[PDB]
């Protein structure tokens, strides 16, 4: 009825929404509980009564803030300032690594997180195309980022909280940093062959349409939609019959 928004008022209110997947991620207790990205201020020392190893990469509102760890505060609390990355990202053991991205910067640190580090579960909320520049392995970007990780789209909010009228959509992607699918030897070239498996080099990569058979044999017509997980196995096939694997 006579109602009253016409206004010019937007809040995210979606204290609910980001809490919740946050809140669903569940982990076991051998897995640090990281945060990267910003500080909007709601989170963090919640995340770590998960884990037993909290510590903040960004803003100085964590571990001083942590309302006195129930774990008798004798964990992995720290507080960062400043350059962090090689500072936080250990090594040994497990690790969650929840953080969104600042939407300006981030794939450098998952960059060597997801070079050396051991993180096992890595969660990226984000808000815009950084999911789908991952599934997408025909930039070579997100396919360098997911032989090391396993992601798997798993909350998708459409920013209703957003209000009033939201624009971007926020989904969580639940990526798995795991030791390797692809011999960090025949990496670079598996790289190289994303390229040309890219652009549309197929009767470049086929010798005779050999494997464009193993295409239409593994249900992958169109890879446009592709995750990696196809190259991984036809490249696989490539290197089986040149000699670099």
């Not at 201020?41 to 309302?67: C, P, R, W, Y």
């Not at 997911?146 to 009033?164: D, R, Y």
């Amino acid at each position: 009825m006579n109602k009253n928004i016409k206004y010019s008022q937007n809040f995210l209110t979606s204290e609910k929404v980001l809490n919740q997947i946050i809140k669903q991620l569940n982990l076991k207790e051998t897995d640090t509980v990281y945060e990267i990205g910003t500080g909007k201020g709601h989170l963090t020392t919640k995340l770590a009564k998960i884990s037993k190893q909290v510590t903040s990469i960004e803003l100085d509102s964590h571990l001083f803030n942590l309302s006195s760890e129930k774990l008798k505060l004798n964990t992995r609390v720290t507080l960062i300032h400043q350059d962090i990355l090689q500072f936080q990202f250990p090594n040994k053991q497990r690790y969650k690594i929840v953080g969104n991205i600042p939407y300006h910067l981030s794939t450098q640190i998952i960059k060597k997180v997801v070079f050396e580090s051991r993180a096992s579960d890595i969660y990226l909320i984000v808000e815009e195309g950084f999911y789908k520049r991952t599934l997408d392995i025909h930039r070579t970007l997100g396919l360098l980022l997911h032989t090391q990780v396993s992601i798997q789209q798993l909350l998708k909010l459409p920013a209703e909280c957003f209000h009033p009228k939201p624009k971007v959509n926020s989904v969580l992607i639940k990526l798995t940093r795991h030791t390797t699918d692809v011999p960090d030897k025949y990496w670079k070239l598996y790289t190289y062959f994303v390229s040309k498996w890219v652009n549309r080099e197929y009767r470049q990569l086929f010798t005779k349409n050999q494997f464009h058979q193993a295409m239409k044999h593994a249900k992958v017509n169109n890879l446009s939609t592709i995750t990696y997980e196809q190259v991984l196995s036809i490249f696989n096939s490539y290197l089986l019959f040149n000699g670099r694997k």
